Design a protein around this ligand. Structure first.
Ligand code: NAP
Ligand code: NAP
Lengths: 202, 202
């Protein structure tokens, strides 16, 4: 399959990249150095970019060509009260990257496009309003776009993951207790994706 | 009560302004001319501003002083597919205005701050992804900020209104069939706000 993994330089992205290395893989991220080495390690193509910049997102997708699978493991985290530019940074990282990618992506019929939201009860708490808002927006955006994409034969998949041990938690003091290994989260997602008709009578 | 109605020049905002004219009312909007006349009509103070500009939002709230009630009747509408800057405009109009206002607002203990979200099943449909996302973000932002504000003795109220006949639908071809009159929507909201203990034994 032709696979594009954005956020490839992140915790989840890297797990997905190694789990899918047998495919025609394209990896994208902001840290070019880290990106190039991972791509080389898994035999993929490295195409660095800032997906919050629509022109860069557009050039990435036009270059990638028709995709069978897209995994947008893009995001950023932050903690702050609403009473004292985090909101804009969060929306840019989570929503704009996804919106620009989804708008310019070339898809094969039957393709799947995976995005990551969040369990409402877990993020909609003091200190995470900005993050919660960004994910609330992303999920709403995708649900609305759902029928539009299906018309093109593309299936949008919204993933809700529990805490995962990655660098995302760096500015938050590290992952919480019991956070899944990124490899395990990717395995479960890929497993959630893996029922085909046994008999087709035309 | 000291009341601030942002989006006062809009359909809902105007209804709220006329319904609350007996109070110490402050009205804000972008169209200065329309704003000044409504304010004069209801004996309120007119303070025009672009709430997507944080410095303007900050100056408005510092000038308004401690509020007993805030009604953020701010927003914009638009229709577009996700496959072909609406998303950023929607987030700015619905979320950033609310976030900047909520951050700099001065509140009296017991104050209420009203915001407008949307019924998910109604907006999360083809053509309204951007709008849906903005409202999805706003509701998530507020739910998270809920406990933070309660600590200050402030109650955040999230309102979900059905279609209402206002200029919001202008770029969409006009309000749908059965859309409520803005006056009726405001009456119901104000009614939803209006149970006090009859006996307090200290
Ligand atoms: N980790 C968790 O506990 C958890 C839980 C629920 C959902 N999620 C979501 O899962 C996804 C991946 O999270 P993660 O744990 O892998 O975070 P991560 O380790 O910090 O990786 C984040 C990725 O996003 C990329 N990115 C950020 N801004 C970008 C931009 N403007 N343009 C292009 N790429 C950008 C980063 O690229 P660079 O590093 O190269 O700059 C990085 O590759 C995110 O949507 C996250 O919100 C995570
Ligand atoms: N109408 C409906 O069917 C419906 C349904 C559900 C929810 N809602 C929500 O209810 C609220 C009011 O809607 P409405 O029907 O009254 O819309 P409306 O008639 O178009 O009024 C919108 C108001 O938002 C103000 N505004 C927009 N951008 C602004 C900015 N950047 N800075 C400051 N003010 C800004 C506009 O000011 P100017 O006109 O002066 O530029 C106007 O006062 C919105 O949140 C809307 O999404 C409406």
């Amino acid at each position: 399959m032709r696979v594009l993994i954005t956020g490839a330089t992140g915790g989840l992205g890297g797990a997905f990249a190694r789990a899918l290395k047998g495919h025609d893989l394209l990896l994208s991220g902001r840290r070019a150095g880290a990106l190039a080495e991972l791509a080389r390690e898994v035999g993929a193509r490295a195409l660095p970019a800032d997906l919050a910049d629509e022109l860069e997102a557009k050039a990435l997708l036009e270059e990638a060509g028709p995709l069978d699978l897209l995994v947008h493991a893009v995001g950023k985290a932050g903690r702050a009260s609403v009473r004292e530019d985090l909101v804009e940074e969060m929306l840019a990282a989570h929503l704009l990257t996804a919106a620009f990618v989804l708008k310019h992506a070339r898809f094969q019929k039957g393709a799947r496009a995976v995005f990551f939201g969040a369990y409402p009860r877990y993020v909609q708490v003091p200190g995470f309003a900005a993050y919660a808002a960004a994910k609330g927006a992303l999920e709403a955006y995708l649900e609305a776009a759902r029928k539009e994409l299906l018309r093109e034969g593309v299936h949008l998949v919204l993933v809700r993951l529990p805490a995962v041990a990655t660098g995302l938690w760096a500015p938050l003091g590290g992952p919480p207790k019991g956070a899944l290994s990124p490899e395990e989260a990717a395995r479960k997602v890929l497993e959630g994706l893996f029922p085909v008709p046994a008999l087709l009578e035309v």
